[PDB]
Amino acid sequence: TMDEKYVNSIWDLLKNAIQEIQRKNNSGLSFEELYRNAYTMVLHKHGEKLYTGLREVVTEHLINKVREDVLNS
Amino acid sequence: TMDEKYVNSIWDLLKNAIQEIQRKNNSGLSFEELYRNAYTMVLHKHGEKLYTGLREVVTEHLINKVREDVLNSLNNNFLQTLNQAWNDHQTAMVMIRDILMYMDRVYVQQNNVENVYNLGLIIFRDQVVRYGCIRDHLRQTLLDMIARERKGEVVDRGAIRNACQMLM
Amino acid sequence: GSVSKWVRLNVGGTYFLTTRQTLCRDPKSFLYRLCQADPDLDSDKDETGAYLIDRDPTYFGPVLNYLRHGKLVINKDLAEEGVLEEAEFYNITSLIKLVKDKIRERDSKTSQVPVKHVYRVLQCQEEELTQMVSTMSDGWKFEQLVSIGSSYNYGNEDQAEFLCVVSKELHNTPYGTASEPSEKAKILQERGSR
Amino acid sequence: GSVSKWVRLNVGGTYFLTTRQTLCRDPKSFLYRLCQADPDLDSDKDETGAYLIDRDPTYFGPVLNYLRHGKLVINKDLAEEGVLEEAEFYNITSLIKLVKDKIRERDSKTSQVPVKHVYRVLQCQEEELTQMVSTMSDGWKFEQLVSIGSSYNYGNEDQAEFLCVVSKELHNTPYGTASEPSEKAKILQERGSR
Amino acid sequence: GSVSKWVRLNVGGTYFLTTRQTLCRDPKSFLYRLCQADPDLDSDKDETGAYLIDRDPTYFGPVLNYLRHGKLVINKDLAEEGVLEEAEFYNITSLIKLVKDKIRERDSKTSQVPVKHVYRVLQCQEEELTQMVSTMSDGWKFEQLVSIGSSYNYGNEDQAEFLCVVSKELHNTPYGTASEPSEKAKILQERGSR
Amino acid sequence: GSVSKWVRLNVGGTYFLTTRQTLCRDPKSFLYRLCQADPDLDSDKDETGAYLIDRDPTYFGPVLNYLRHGKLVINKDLAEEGVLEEAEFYNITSLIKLVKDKIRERDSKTSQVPVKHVYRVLQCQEEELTQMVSTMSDGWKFEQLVSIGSSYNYGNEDQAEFLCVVSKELHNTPYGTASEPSEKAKILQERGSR
Amino acid sequence: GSVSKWVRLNVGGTYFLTTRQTLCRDPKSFLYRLCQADPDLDSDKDETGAYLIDRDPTYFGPVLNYLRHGKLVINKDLAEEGVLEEAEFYNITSLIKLVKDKIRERDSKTSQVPVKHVYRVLQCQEEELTQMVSTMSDGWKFEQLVSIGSSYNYGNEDQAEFLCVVSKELHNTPYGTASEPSEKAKILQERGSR
């Protein structure tokens, strides 16, 4: 349910894994772990936090990876 | 059970090489042999002897090096000698820690005793910063520099900070 | 080498020679990551030209997967944990529920772990007895027979003379479902309860 | 590497020096073709030239022994299911007759999942148990034995004193019904119904 | 030992070629030393050069799979107790909990191997007897019925009619975490004992 | 180097190290010709050593154990039939007989379905049943105690008051020396019939 | 050349590098005697400095497992008897003890095939019945409950009213089917017999 004591650590680890995927890295990441992380962090009605983090992280990926390669060549 | 005679026989060379490592020397020994030998005796519950041997060699090295160098040094670089002796102690303790993790993970936990890193830190605290003569030397010297610094006089603040960090 | 269209995946150490194309299907699978050469890799060897596969084929097989050549499915002796984790690696909550139901089917038909068993009491008197004992319903198993105290015909041959407690092991439902939305059924259940 | 009688086999990434005949017992197997030389052999590598195989298995062993001696392999932890699953795949031609029993035996086990036990009531006077108990038929197991009174002398020393109840499994394959087009058998069953 | 992206462990004389990164999951396990190519752990072999670990490969399997893909899969042909011991050797608390859960599932499934097994006795007469035999819980197995002497008439329709001993195969939890009493619970137990 | 005083065998492509004399414990075995230094070999290689033995190494284990210390080993994963095949390959007659006994013991329980279970009935009173069950015979399982209705000597405290039926499964080989009785055995059987 | 702090030992075909300390579990063990060079040993593998001894590594498996880990767990698929044979050849009384304990555990686990199974009888009153079945000891399975006549206090609610019969798969013997007797125990058994 609603409690913020554990959400921070799993949240930062999840966003780090999302970026690693963005940084072309799944050879060290297990999809089951990240999937379970997303599920437990969703079902506790923190889905607004995922909606925000998702939006910002896709924008960040577009800037950090897509925009650089678009402009550099 | 297994006969302990040759275990102790090789344990003597093991402790001698441990003391060599304590002096920051690894150019006259095989690190693989020390690692394997030290790791092996832990499985079969000789870790009490290993713990005591490490304790005594650490204590002897501390007494014969750190206290002697601290007492031989004069003030206004008494902090420098103390700091470098502490750094050598920490380097030796880290290199010793590199030898042993299994005992530092299984034996100390199952015996519920102090880790050799923490045990050696306790020995250093008891023999340097809580030992009377060295403690009072350090205290009066630090008091003197922090008095003189407020006068605009030139003192090295890094050493004072480092000594306080050792203290806490 | 593994920098060309062919690669040698070190699956359990074993060199599997395979095209990059058969392994590049989508990034959902782990393997797509290994065959696709990219920076920031630490799963590759340049001493022999091979992309390592850290998973030995010992539960790389029972993975529930489609679209290539192999095999899958939990058996009646295949581990539940492995199939469950391999299903969760393929996402969907419906997939999780269906795989759990499949495990409950394979464990509940014999009724072990779901431990699902059905029991009945057949009131039969003596002459009838060997009848339903011999003419028992197949798929069932007799468990106990107990006489009844009687006040007619010297305590033998009453209109109620024996309870044959029979049973059978099987899932009532292999999904382990319960609860009905029909309110009239609930009304009738409560009516027959008293 | 065919440079002598011994050739290189790739399992676990390791290269094993195996003779031709350990790979060759019939033209159907996959290990045979590696002892035949042709310019289409694309299993060559740049390390030593060893020939790569998928094998890093868990059930190839006893059934390779089966290939090498031709007797189906059942273990105390791997029954006729193990035959029925692996010994079929390694393509031993003699198994087709054998696995049928493995199929029936397997069925004979899976047929008891909806437990099918023949249940029999045998009335015995007390003095009459131990004989027919000690001479119980093979595959017939004792299951229950219930006392009963009688009109005369409370039941003891009378033929109506005990009812043994025994059961036997089926070796039958699973069924849904039994039917034969003989009408007179149905006439006899109906006549004996009353 | 020899420097490579992977590492080759001599686990019980058996070469485990696994990547160094999958061994960095638990520094709190002995493996994370074995992966050091720098003189933090130095070990070699006078035949290959592999690092030496005096831990079995018997139960190293499931633990290594748990390290590789995050979930343990104890093969249902090896002692879960051995897997728990291997988990203890690397003292991974989550892995300890998982293997203990597996052992609990075993003990619930193997309650007839001497481990936890719960039993009860209900009291009912025939009217309610049929009802609660029919409405017997899923998991609780009927084991015996018995009549009790009825002061009313000679038999049925007395409140003291039938005891119903029933059972359930219950999980045995490995000790050190379960069956830990409490002070007020013991006070109430002493109160109710008389 | 094949033999100087020790012999390196290649059993089915698997290298094993032993000595001439361990095989020479039984000088009638097939390995006798292989181990001894003689040009009778029809399969050997001196390019890298070791005679070629194209046979099961999986079922060579128990046979070599008997060859070394005269004792058969019956593993749970071992097909007793398969080790019988290997033993007859290596001509160990007593091992053949013992493994045949093992095969038939396993079949009388597992593959022939559990059959010929021995059942016995024992008269006991309370004072006798308590320690009889307490002193229950080795390899025997209690099956059912029943209280016989009694009018003589009350219905309690009577030497004939309880019947305890017990059993012992026969995972037993049928006698190959002659499970068919002789003429005088049948004479005594018909004498004891009535 | 052939001996160091560690030692290479060729049990079977394979070579294990193990410390001389680990190989000895008692100074009467043959392995320890083989650790140091003896003038009696002639045949050895001087190719790699590893002594040649002739035993199966599969039963060396649990032996080395106990030697390295200090606890013996024999796999459910491997013969504990093979482990015992390995121990008896290597002359390790400690291993004799564990194999004995494991064999007792297995005989408990195999207490369905003929091997001793403990059975016990308890008294209970109608009131006490629920308690002592409920408070029936863990590790024991309830087997039977029998009602009896009441020699005191009417026909029901008697201190001697119901006989419960329970059992334990583990045998009561100190070891297996035969334990080394003691004479004073027989003296007291004769004393209590009369």
UniProtKB/Swiss-Prot annotation, chain A:
According to its UniProt record, in which tissues is this protein expressed? Brain, spermatozoa, and testis (at protein level). Widely expressed.
Superkingdom is Eukaryota
Compartment annotation? Nucleus; Golgi apparatus; Cell projection, Cilium, Flagellum; Cytoplasm, Cytoskeleton, Spindle
Q: How is it modified after translation?
A: Neddylated. Attachment of NEDD8 is required for the E3 ubiquitin-protein ligase activity of the BCR complex. Deneddylated via its interaction with the COP9 signalosome (CSN) complex.
Q: How does it assemble?
A: Forms neddylation-dependent homodimers. Component of multiple BCR (BTB-CUL3-RBX1) E3 ubiquitin-protein ligase complexes formed of CUL3, RBX1 and a variable BTB domain-containing protein acting as both, adapter to cullin and substrate recognition subunit. The BCR complex may be active as a heterodimeric complex, in which NEDD8, covalently attached to one CUL3 molecule, binds to the C-terminus of a second CUL3 molecule. Interacts with RBX1, RNF7, CYCE and TIP120A/CAND1. Part of the BCR(SPOP) containing SPOP, and of BCR containing homodimeric SPOPL or the heterodimer formed by SPOP and SPOPL.
Q: What does this protein do?
A: Core component of multiple cullin-RING-based BCR (BTB-CUL3-RBX1) E3 ubiquitin-protein ligase complexes which mediate the ubiquitination and subsequent proteasomal degradation of target proteins. BCR complexes and ARIH1 collaborate in tandem to mediate ubiquitination of target proteins. As a scaffold protein may contribute to catalysis through positioning of the substrate and the ubiquitin-conjugating enzyme.
Please share what else the UniProt entry notes about this protein: High-glucose conditions in renal tubular epithelial cells lead to up-regulation of CUL3 expression, significant increase in CUL3-mediated ubiquitination of MRPL12 and dysregulation of mitochondrial biosynthesis.
Reported disease: Pseudohypoaldosteronism 2E: An autosomal dominant disorder characterized by severe hypertension, hyperkalemia, hyperchloremia, hyperchloremic metabolic acidosis, and correction of physiologic abnormalities by thiazide diuretics.
- Family assignment? Belongs to the cullin family.
Name-wise, this protein is: Cullin-3
Protein's organism: Homo sapiens (Human)
Swiss-Prot record, chains C, D, E, F, G:
- Cellular component GO terms, alphabetical: Cul3-RING ubiquitin ligase complex; cytoplasm; cytosol; nucleus
Enumerate the spans annotated as BTB domain: 5-107
An annotated GO BP: proteasome-mediated ubiquitin-dependent protein catabolic process
- Write the record's keywords in alphabetical order, separated by commas: Acetylation, Cytoplasm, Host-virus interaction, Nucleus, Phosphoprotein
Say where the protein is mainly found.
Answer: cytoplasm
Q: Does the keyword Amino-acid biosynthesis apply?
A: no
Instruction: Indicate the secretion signal residues.
Output: none
Q: Name one GO molecular function term.
A: identical protein binding
Entry comment, domain topic = The BTB (POZ) domain is atypical and mediates the formation of a homopentamer instead of a homotetramer. Homopentamerization is due to the presence of 4 residues in the BTB (POZ) domain: Leu-17, Gly-61, Val-73 and Ala-79.
What's this chain's function? Answer: Its interaction with CUL3 suggests that it may act as a substrate adapter in some E3 ligase complex. Does not affect the function of Kv channel Kv2.1/KCNB1, Kv1.2/KCNA2, Kv4.2/KCND2 and Kv3.4/KCNC4.
Its name, as the record gives it, is BTB/POZ domain-containing protein KCTD5
Name the source organism: Homo sapiens (Human)
